[PDB]
Design a binder for this molecule. Structure first.
Ligand SMILES: Nc1ncnc2c1ncn2[C@@H]1O[C@H](COP(=O)(O)OP(=O)(O)OP(O)(O)=S)[C@@H](O)[C@H]1O
Ligand SMILES: Nc1ncnc2c1ncn2[C@@H]1O[C@H](COP(=O)(O)OP(=O)(O)OP(O)(O)=S)[C@@H](O)[C@H]1O
Ligand SMILES: [Mg+2]
Ligand SMILES: [Mg+2]
Lengths: 432, 113, 62, 62, 62
């Protein structure tokens, strides 16, 4: 035994203890950790083969928690994970006694702070505007103009602000702005080529008055004395307001349209930093963060996941590049564990899902360079996307029954090694 | 007098016109079976087993097919001095240092664009 | 090695050196650089296989 | 519910679904006032006949 | 009074309707495997002893 031990001990640097070999139970097995977690890892296993327990053992060995005794109590080391858990399964694999001095971040629907002013274009165009998927060229543009010209009011210090830029922007103001444009009536008179309010006091910059309160516009007529001609966009929008006031009053999504601080207040353009810390465990100094997605509905999960992934990626990209300016490699790595993937990453699915597949797909192509890696756990590969499981470079195969799904594993194995691909349908519980 | 050389992460995710007119192929490590089919097909029969190695080619090995060579073959490439910045983060080494401090002001402002 | 390299290259006119031959790290592999660099060439590879580095090496040697 | 009662391949499907939702949400309160935080999906009692009546009144109103 | 003469380096890609009516065949070295099978099917009087020579043909043999 001693020699087969040393073989793995001293040949390979940066080892990662995994478990026992099936040939002999006593021996210990180790693998290159700088390769495992540097290139995307994948677990595929049927029911009852215990994928989750294996993932938990891996993560425990990674963070040091062994034998219910945190070894790194006095000083803390670096390890950053983000688990997407649908059914609160992993929330207890890391719950040690107070003596262990372990700080864990546990987030849920009730306590998740993810506002709307941090969503890019396509996301908003999906969530707010719902009509004739692309047949709304007027409303779309005017909406964009409203948001763009409103952002500059509430954060006037910044320069060259664009639509897609993440800063505060109120939606109620925009709704009332359009509701004002609806009933506009221009007071067409000599040198009076602009709007007219009830008190006959014209207006010069719409962006100064519509945003705050509804106004009562004056009448229209062709009489030469009080010639007031109708507005350009009147009638066009009579329904968008009534369609929005509904959504904006849904309670299930109140965690995205009406965010609040611990002191019961709305976030400002300077709190952005904090909104990120948590998703990376820097607030509570918790190496691990565990999201729960059960209570969430089906219709908004697809975006709630995309947004988190995007935030993580942007942080990693910009920090890794600002570090590359000097030449050194990034030092804040992140591992994203995607559980029950087959719910929000179908192979053949409608756009109702697409908003997610893109985000994650990015990490699968060009994430390595910047400091993010993935770990997918799925029950049935042929349901998971093809791009994602085309790039992964380490497969952990537990028991699998059908033959159509075997192909993916039975391929990666070469010829002379072949012969093991037949052991799959007899694997006992816990083996790999 | 104008010529092309394109590099892609997978072949299927490129137009079928370009590749069709591309003479010589330089094939590195590939895992999926679909991508493997394309590369396996192109090779001759006298020496075709060479495709069995694709799934486990090392970090640098390449298989060549086309007309330029006298016959298909495998090879290593020595690293280029200097290198283009593409380094892979070392994860477990960076996961055994102390917690590091990140001046968000910097990252956020740069994000601000 | 000598006779092998001769048989490999001497026939072609304008050679392009590429790298070592896996079956023998001693020899140096050469290819017709005219059929190459003239007919369109392509590269495909997974993540971590060394695409950009090889492209850079080819360019640098060219 | 979106299935059993409604079609989805028309010119004006969105602008009727997005009102049937509101109709059910409202009809759920009147006959279940005690509670709060009612949502489209929450199981409580309601009448489809009233829904038809409401969507019929909404069409002719001037 | 009109006859054809087709010359292609990869017959599998060229339509099947044409080669069928073609009577007399001239064959040189062939490497790919797919084309070999098709050419072995269409060629009328190919005794198995001859076909095996296709890929070993020297420079110029026909
Ligand atoms: N090394 C082990 N020792 C003892 N029991 C084990 C071991 N490995 C697995 N098991 C048993 O296997 C079961 C684990 O099943 P789960 O991990 O719940 O399956 P799963 O991976 O969650 O499947 P899903 O539905 O895809 S999450 C437990 O009942 C364990 O007792
Ligand atoms: N000859 C070699 N010997 C040892 N290591 C090598 C060699 N060539 C490349 N590498 C390693 O390969 C890594 C770079 O791979 P890349 O060529 O950047 O992958 P890639 O083709 O850029 O994939 P991307 O991300 O899609 S551009 C470096 O970290 C090198 O250490
Ligand atoms: Mg599980
Ligand atoms: Mg590159």
């Amino acid at each position: 035994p001693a020699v087969l031990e040393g073989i793995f001990s001293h040949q390979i640097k940066s080892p990662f203890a995994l478990g026992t070999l099936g040939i002999s139970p006593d021996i210990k097995l180790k693998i290159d950790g700088d390769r495992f977690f540097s290139k995307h890892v994948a677990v595929v296993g049927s029911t009852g083969s215990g994928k989750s327990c294996a993932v938990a053992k891996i993560l425990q060995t990674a963070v040091g928690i062994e034998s219910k005794a945190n070894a790194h109590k006095a000083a803390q080391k670096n390890s950053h994970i983000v688990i997407f858990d649908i059914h609160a399964e992993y929330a207890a694999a890391f719950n040690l006694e107070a003596g262990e001095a372990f700080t864990l971040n546990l987030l849920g629907v009730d306590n998740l702070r993810l506002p709307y002013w941090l969503m890019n274009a396509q996301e908003l165009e999906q969530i707010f505007i719902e009509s004739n998927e692309h047949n709304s060229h007027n409303q779309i543009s005017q909406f964009r103009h409203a948001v763009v010209r409103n952002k500059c009011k509430h954060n006037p210090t910044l320069t060259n602000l664009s639509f897609d830029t993440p800063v505060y922007f109120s939606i109620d103001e925009v709704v009332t702005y359009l509701e004002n444009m609806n009933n506009e009536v221009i007071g067409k008179l000599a040198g009076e080529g602009k709007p007219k309010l009830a008190n006959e006091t014209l207006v010069s910059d719409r962006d100064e008055l519509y945003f705050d309160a509804v106004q009562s516009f004056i009448v229209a007529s062709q009489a030469a004395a009080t010639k007031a001609s109708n507005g350009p966009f009147n009638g066009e929008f009579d329904r968008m307001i009534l369609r929005l006031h509904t959504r904006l009053a849904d309670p299930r999504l109140q965690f995205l349209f009406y965010p609040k601080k611990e002191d019961g207040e709305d976030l400002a353009t300077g709190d952005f930093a904090d909104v990120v810390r948590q998703f990376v465990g820097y607030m509570t100094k918790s190496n691990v963060s565990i999201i729960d997605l059960s209570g969430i509905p089906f219709e908004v999960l697809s975006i709630v996941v995309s947004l988190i992934s995007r935030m993580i990626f942007d942080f990693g990209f910009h920090y890794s590049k600002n570090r590359h300016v000097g030449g050194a490699v990034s030092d804040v790595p992140i591992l994203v564990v995607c559980e029950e993937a087959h719910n929000y990453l179908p192979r053949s699915g409608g756009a109702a899902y697409d908003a997610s597949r893109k985000s994650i797909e990015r990490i699968a192509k060009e994430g390595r360079k910047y400091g993010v890696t993935l770990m997918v756990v799925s029950q049935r590969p042929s349901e998971v996307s093809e791009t994602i499981f085309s790039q992964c470079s380490n497969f952990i195969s537990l028991r699998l029954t059908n033959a159509v799904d075997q192909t993916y594993v039975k391929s990666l194995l070469p010829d002379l090694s072949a012969g093991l691909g037949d052991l799959l349908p007899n694997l006992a519980q816990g083996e790999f | 007098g104008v010529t092309l050389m394109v590099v892609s992460q997978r072949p299927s995710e490129v137009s079928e016109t370009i590749f069709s007119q591309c003479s010589n192929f330089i094939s590195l490590r590939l895992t999926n079976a679909v991508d493997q089919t394309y590369v396996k097909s192109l090779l001759p029969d006298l020496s075709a087993g060479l495709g069995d190695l694709l799934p486990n080619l090392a970090q640098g090995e390449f298989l060549i097919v086309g007309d330029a060579p006298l016959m298909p073959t495998v090879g290593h490439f020595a690293l280029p001095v200097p290198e283009p910045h593409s380094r892979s983060v070392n994860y477990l080494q960076e996961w055994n240092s102390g917690w590091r401090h990140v001046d968000f002001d910097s990252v956020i402002d740069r994000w601000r664009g």
